Design a protein around this ligand. Sequence first.
Ligand SMILES: *[C@@H]1O[C@H](CO)[C@@H](O[C@@H]2O[C@H](CO)[C@@H](O[C@H]3O[C@H](CO)[C@@H](O)[C@H](O)[C@@H]3O)[C@H](O)[C@H]2NC(C)=O)[C@H](O)[C@H]1NC(C)=O
Ligand SMILES: *[C@@H]1O[C@H](CO)[C@@H](O[C@@H]2O[C@H](CO)[C@@H](O[C@H]3O[C@H](CO)[C@@H](O)[C@H](O)[C@@H]3O)[C@H](O)[C@H]2NC(C)=O)[C@H](O)[C@H]1NC(C)=O
Ligand SMILES: *[C@@H]1O[C@H](CO[C@@H]2O[C@@H](C)[C@@H](O)[C@@H](O)[C@@H]2O)[C@@H](O[C@@H]2O[C@H](CO)[C@@H](O)[C@H](O)[C@H]2NC(C)=O)[C@H](O)[C@H]1NC(C)=O
Ligand SMILES: *[C@@H]1O[C@H](CO)[C@@H](O[C@@H]2O[C@H](CO)[C@@H](O)[C@H](O)[C@H]2NC(C)=O)[C@H](O)[C@H]1NC(C)=O
Ligand SMILES: *[C@@H]1O[C@H](CO)[C@@H](O[C@@H]2O[C@H](CO)[C@@H](O)[C@H](O)[C@H]2NC(C)=O)[C@H](O)[C@H]1NC(C)=O
Ligand SMILES: *[C@@H]1O[C@H](CO)[C@@H](O[C@@H]2O[C@H](CO)[C@@H](O)[C@H](O)[C@H]2NC(C)=O)[C@H](O)[C@H]1NC(C)=O
Ligand SMILES: *[C@@H]1O[C@H](CO)[C@@H](O[C@@H]2O[C@H](CO)[C@@H](O)[C@H](O)[C@H]2NC(C)=O)[C@H](O)[C@H]1NC(C)=O
Ligand SMILES: *[C@@H]1O[C@H](CO)[C@@H](O)[C@H](O)[C@H]1NC(C)=O
Ligand SMILES: *[C@@H]1O[C@H](CO)[C@@H](O)[C@H](O)[C@H]1NC(C)=O
Ligand SMILES: *[C@@H]1O[C@H](CO)[C@@H](O)[C@H](O)[C@H]1NC(C)=O
Ligand SMILES: *[C@@H]1O[C@H](CO)[C@@H](O)[C@H](O)[C@H]1NC(C)=O
Lengths: 268, 250, 294
Amino acid sequence: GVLTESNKKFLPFQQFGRDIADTTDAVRDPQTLEILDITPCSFGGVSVITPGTNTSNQVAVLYQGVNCTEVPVAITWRVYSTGSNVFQTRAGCLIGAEHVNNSYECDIPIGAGICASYQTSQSIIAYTMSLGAENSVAYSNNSIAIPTNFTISVTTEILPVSMTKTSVDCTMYICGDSTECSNLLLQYGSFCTQLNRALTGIAVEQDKNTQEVFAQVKQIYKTPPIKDFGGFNFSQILPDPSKPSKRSFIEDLLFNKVTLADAGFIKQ
Amino acid sequence: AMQMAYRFNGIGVTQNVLYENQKLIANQFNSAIGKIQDSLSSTASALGKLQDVVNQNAQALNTLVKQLSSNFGAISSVLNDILSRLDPPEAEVQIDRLITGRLQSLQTYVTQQLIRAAEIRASANLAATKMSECVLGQSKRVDFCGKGYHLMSFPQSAPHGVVFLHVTYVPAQEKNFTTAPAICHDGKAHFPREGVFVSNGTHWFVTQRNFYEPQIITTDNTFVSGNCDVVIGIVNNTVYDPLQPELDSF
Amino acid sequence: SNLLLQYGSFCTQLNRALTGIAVEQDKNTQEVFAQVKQIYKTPPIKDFGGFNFSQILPDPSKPSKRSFIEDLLFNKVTLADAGFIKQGDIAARDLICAQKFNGLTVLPPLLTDEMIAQYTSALLAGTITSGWTFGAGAALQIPFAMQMAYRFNGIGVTQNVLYENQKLIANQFNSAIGKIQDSLSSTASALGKLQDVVNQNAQALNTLVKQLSSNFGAISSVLNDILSRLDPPEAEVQIDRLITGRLQSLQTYVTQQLIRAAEIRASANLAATKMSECVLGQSKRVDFCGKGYH
Ligand SMILES: *[C@@H]1O[C@H](CO)[C@@H](O[C@@H]2O[C@H](CO)[C@@H](O[C@H]3O[C@H](CO)[C@@H](O)[C@H](O)[C@@H]3O)[C@H](O)[C@H]2NC(C)=O)[C@H](O)[C@H]1NC(C)=O
Ligand SMILES: *[C@@H]1O[C@H](CO)[C@@H](O[C@@H]2O[C@H](CO)[C@@H](O[C@H]3O[C@H](CO)[C@@H](O)[C@H](O)[C@@H]3O)[C@H](O)[C@H]2NC(C)=O)[C@H](O)[C@H]1NC(C)=O
Ligand SMILES: *[C@@H]1O[C@H](CO[C@@H]2O[C@@H](C)[C@@H](O)[C@@H](O)[C@@H]2O)[C@@H](O[C@@H]2O[C@H](CO)[C@@H](O)[C@H](O)[C@H]2NC(C)=O)[C@H](O)[C@H]1NC(C)=O
Ligand SMILES: *[C@@H]1O[C@H](CO)[C@@H](O[C@@H]2O[C@H](CO)[C@@H](O)[C@H](O)[C@H]2NC(C)=O)[C@H](O)[C@H]1NC(C)=O
Ligand SMILES: *[C@@H]1O[C@H](CO)[C@@H](O[C@@H]2O[C@H](CO)[C@@H](O)[C@H](O)[C@H]2NC(C)=O)[C@H](O)[C@H]1NC(C)=O
Ligand SMILES: *[C@@H]1O[C@H](CO)[C@@H](O[C@@H]2O[C@H](CO)[C@@H](O)[C@H](O)[C@H]2NC(C)=O)[C@H](O)[C@H]1NC(C)=O
Ligand SMILES: *[C@@H]1O[C@H](CO)[C@@H](O[C@@H]2O[C@H](CO)[C@@H](O)[C@H](O)[C@H]2NC(C)=O)[C@H](O)[C@H]1NC(C)=O
Ligand SMILES: *[C@@H]1O[C@H](CO)[C@@H](O)[C@H](O)[C@H]1NC(C)=O
Ligand SMILES: *[C@@H]1O[C@H](CO)[C@@H](O)[C@H](O)[C@H]1NC(C)=O
Ligand SMILES: *[C@@H]1O[C@H](CO)[C@@H](O)[C@H](O)[C@H]1NC(C)=O
Ligand SMILES: *[C@@H]1O[C@H](CO)[C@@H](O)[C@H](O)[C@H]1NC(C)=O
């Protein structure tokens, strides 16, 4: 830590001052009876603000909870600390991003109302994001606005219903194929039974979730062979009988869009 | 068509609007459906919720697997290697260290899965409520079944999830009008039975609140209550009783 | 650190969990408040048919455009730390100096209180100037008397009742707003639902910090003195005891924080639903938007 002059008061021959976390906060010099307060030297997290790698390799770094005055103190890498790019934010001091006065809709959230984005040659800007367009509704005590037309707007809403059923064997996961370890683990009472009960409850609850969401009709209605629905066209959402799966065009699109390139089903 | 007229009456728009703009509404709905299919095909990040759920489950499982390769303070992370190198009375310490580490990993994984399952159960309860109140009905709740005045909804199956196509009625082309709370005809106050009084500059009409369909002010469009001097903002205008010219011709 | 390395990925697991909590906090705030993409503004002339919104409309006198009631609430609740980076709570203002030094910090919200107040101002101005139409599409202006008449027809009362009793209803509304202001200024625990959240977070952090003073079986509770007093080969076990105790402390704290964040997310979903159904429209659900006919 760092040592500094202290405005504290001590006993005639007191020694030091501890704090809440059982860490010494101040100390009296043994040689000369002078008191120093111990403040740990600067530390904090590091966040790297970047666009996509294909977009650019330029990055900006945010030293969280830190004014950049201790960046010259430790002046591992030090490439971007040349200066003229230092910006002070309430989320820490930002290095490598230009500050601009105007406002835009947020692209990369930094904190305390500051966002970063890649704009025009090309550089990373840091701005106080705008909450939205201004608007003064023409209110009057005798004026009204009435729609003379309309639009029919369809919007999507994706909701997760269930998740993957996983059941584990506690003993096998811990030390499968080990009699000595099986006997030793048996001394821990019923922990594996508790874990298996919890995971089985989750697995059954997944089926309950799916049933509650979907099985709300006891009769499987089907549309008539004549699609005379007043001109409305439901082909994209009605099932397509040609495919082996009796699901619609949009359903195929969704099932193809959801990718499991991670270890989800690759470990099948 | 009659179902959609029922929905229009549900949102406060007279069914004559649908019966006169059926072709336009069908075209708009078909265009919206095509736009949805294009967006779902070309977005590549639309199913973010389901993708995140799958990624979280996979990441938790891989973390649980990788925890099998940690010493947890023991001589080695391989139980067979520990057993071969050490005789059982001293090997029990290493085996117990591994047992504690692996059991702690299992407990952490199970607690995380319980919390995530609670989250998924909340989302599934929301999805069931949305199914019941949008697919099986017409919800008056604002922003529940999409933005705008909800009309009807379509469910679509998704991997470990559900997709709702919320069809809504959005007012589009506004126009300014001069309005009054009531009308003075013969010392009486006429309030709109179902609609709003609007002036196009020189004449006073009665219009439904959600669509400009001006109509002449009559005794059918309005009800009488009180006198003129009490209502703040009342205006003088003629209220035409259809029975009076009929008995004039009589 | 080397001794902790053999425990695997526990620290990165806890860091991921806490970061997820922190990001979903911003998600909750954005979901509740940023429900309008258009920042409406009240007209300079406040001719709202006798209704008085001055105590809920923003105050340009204050540097932050907060209403009188919003300022009352902010004075009422004494937060712990507002993300102020260290260059009557009586606990947190010194539990942000050493607590920060304990290798655990507090992040600032992405939306500043001024931005939250701007969302609130836009929502309230759009409401009082356009009824419920700004939540279904463009803001359609309408006199507030006629908007309230539409609300009366919604609750099943003829609009002639409002047009006959406009002065009385406006006076009652202003009196009720004044009563709310006086109750907020005089009360002690009306914002207890937020005070408990702040106190729970403070207690969790206090317990987590105080767990650094426990030996957990080691000779001392201070890592530096253990290392400076004993050689590595025998200090291994003392460091291991301290590591095990402090990892259990972090696991407990993070699990409690995850459960509490789930509770807060449920509350924020309820708040967003209440905003959508009560502020952006008129709700027929009984006792949802208050006691009575909404
Ligand atoms: C406000 O709405 C008024 C009613 O819709 C409208 O008055 C109407 O004006 C039109 C002319 O644009 C008249 O149409 C008639 O014009 C001639 C002369 O009267 C006739 O020979 C034709 O056959 C044709 O029917 C309407 O008669 C008249 N409405 C009434 C009830 O007399 C105003 O012009 C509108 N004003 C604005 C500013 O929009
Ligand atoms: C709506 O119609 C009302 C009734 O027709 C009308 O009230 C009438 O107002 C006029 C003048 O504004 C009065 O005429 C006389 O008023 C005073 C008497 O107080 C005389 O000194 C004047 O010289 C003038 O001759 C009518 O007496 C009065 N009618 C009634 C029943 O009180 C409203 O003014 C009309 N409002 C609008 C906006 O058109
Ligand atoms: C409805 O009217 C508002 C404003 O009221 C009118 O404004 C005058 C110009 C005149 O037309 C009078 O009849 C009214 O007093 C319109 O809002 C205006 O929009 C324009 C952009 O097109 C903007 O430049 C103005 O500043 C706005 N007015 C105010 C007071 O802010 C609105 O566009 C009108 N709606 C329609 C559908 O025409
Ligand atoms: C109401 O809006 C619809 C579309 O929003 C209008 O229909 C369009 O009309 C133009 C010509 O004015 C055509 O070029 C478009 O192809 C039409 N679109 C569709 C989807 O049919 C309609 O004219 C508007 N009606 C009024 C009275 O404003
Ligand atoms: C409903 O929409 C579908 C599109 O999904 C229409 O099918 C298209 O029809 C046109 C003209 O007949 C063809 O050129 C396309 O190749 C078809 N595409 C597909 C995917 O089938 C269908 O015709 C529409 N229904 C009606 C009654 O017009
Ligand atoms: C709305 O209410 C506020 C607060 O009650 C009113 O502000 C008062 O105005 C009077 C007249 O200038 C002052 O004497 C009071 O001191 C004000 N009170 C406060 C708390 O500042 C305001 O006037 C009301 N609006 C209208 C249109 O009357
Ligand atoms: C980061 O460090 C700088 C430099 O020490 C701080 O700037 C000082 O701020 C105080 C606050 O009023 C001024 O009185 C000093 O004159 C400033 N310069 C100095 C001390 O050299 C800055 O405040 C620090 N960051 C934060 C967030 O406090
Ligand atoms: C020890 O140091 C202090 C100040 O540095 C001095 O006053 C004192 O005389 C020293 N002790 C002896 C025994 O000289
Ligand atoms: C970056 O964008 C280009 C085209 O804009 C695309 O071809 C490339 O695949 C993108 N990078 C990645 C990693 O997908
Ligand atoms: C931003 O504004 C500040 C003062 O508001 C000014 O000193 C500075 O030069 C401005 N910078 C740019 C790039 O506009
Ligand atoms: C509407 O407000 C204006 C303010 O310019 C006022 O002159 C007029 O009398 C008011 N009308 C009503 C009906 O309140």
